[PDB]
Design a protein around this ligand. Structure first.
Ligand SMILES: CN(C)CCOc1ccc(-c2cc3c(NCCc4ccc(NC(=O)Nc5ccccc5)cc4)ncnc3o2)cc1
Length: 266
């Protein structure tokens, strides 16, 4: 069924994104509340990212998981392209970090568990995210974490180009150095998130791209005193330069700190 802009009532601006804005919207006939992301054709093609948007839709048509944000469909008109998205009422984990500053071990462990499950499902369909970050983590009505943005995802064990513009904070060494990568990139991203959730800033943060680059490359991070031994263990196991030294997602779910602190099952 072909969608058009006049099928929806557009509402509150939900977020300002790199490639476009997200708005709340309601389908007129059903009164179905959802989110519409408006991306501009001109800009998408000028950046050479037009085909990646097609691949996201492709990948999202094959994904069904409670911790992954649904993409219901897409359409376009004279100047832009629209993603029809599941609406996540409690907003981004990004905003939640700003509000709360940092998360306790219980909330962190629960988010890592939900992430791990979502990513474990993705890797079993051979899909790897490559863009994991708090902006792309959304919260459903029960506060359940939902992964968004598969615009930078890849089909197979590949070595394709991700967004090296924008911060490098969540990208692993093998991606920033233009090396061949695989599903292990997502486990690095987990480690970076686990650190950020507990600390309030990501482990390789710097006010310069060039310094953040060097820090990721050296795997140069330190823990504040309030970060517990168990968390330090998990994070340290995830943030390994060599991809193959990083654990499997099921080891993370079985990690004693996760099981002791997570409120949600694996
Ligand atoms: C105070 N506050 C907690 C109250 C509630 O506030 C909010 C705030 C935001 C939301 C919100 C944001 C949001 C949202 N944001 C968009 C997430 C997203 C989706 C798709 C993509 N994909 C993409 O950009 N792909 C791409 C890009 C360029 C080239 C190719 C592909 C990226 C990000 N999506 C769905 N539902 C949503 O709900 C909800 C409540």
């Amino acid at each position: 069924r072909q969608w058009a802009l006049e099928d929806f009532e557009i509402g509150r601006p939900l977020g300002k994104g790199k490639f476009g804005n997200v708005y709340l919207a309601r389908e007129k006939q059903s009164k179905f509340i959802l989110a519409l992301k408006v991306l501009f054709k001109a800009q998408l093609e000028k950046a050479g990212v037009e085909h990646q948007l097609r691949r996201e839709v492709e990948i999202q048509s094959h994904l069904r998981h409670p911790n992954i944000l649904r993409l219901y469909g897409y359409f376009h008109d004279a100047t832009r392209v629209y993603l029809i998205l599941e609406y996540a009422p409690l907003g981004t984990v990004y905003r939640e970090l700003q509000k709360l500053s940092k998360f306790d071990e219980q909330r962190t462990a629960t988010y890592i568990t939900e992430l791990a499950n979502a990513l474990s499902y993705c890797h079993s369909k051979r899909v790897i995210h490559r863009d994991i970050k708090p902006e792309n983590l959304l919260l459903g009505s029960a506060g359940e974490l939902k992964i968004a943005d598969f615009g930078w995802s890849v089909h197979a064990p590949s070595s394709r180009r991700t967004d090296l513009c924008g911060t490098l904070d969540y990208l692993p060494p093998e991606m920033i150095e233009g090396r061949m990568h695989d599903e292990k990139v997502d486990l690095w991203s987990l480690g970076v998130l686990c650190y950020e959730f507990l600390v309030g800033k990501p482990p390789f943060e710097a006010n310069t791209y060039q310094e953040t680059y060097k820090r990721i490359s050296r795997v140069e991070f330190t823990f504040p005193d309030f970060v517990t031994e168990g968390a330090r263990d998990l994070i340290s196991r995830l943030l390994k330069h060599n991809p193959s030294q990083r654990p499997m997602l099921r080891e993370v779910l079985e990690h004693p700190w996760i099981t002791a602190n997570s409120s949600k099952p694996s």
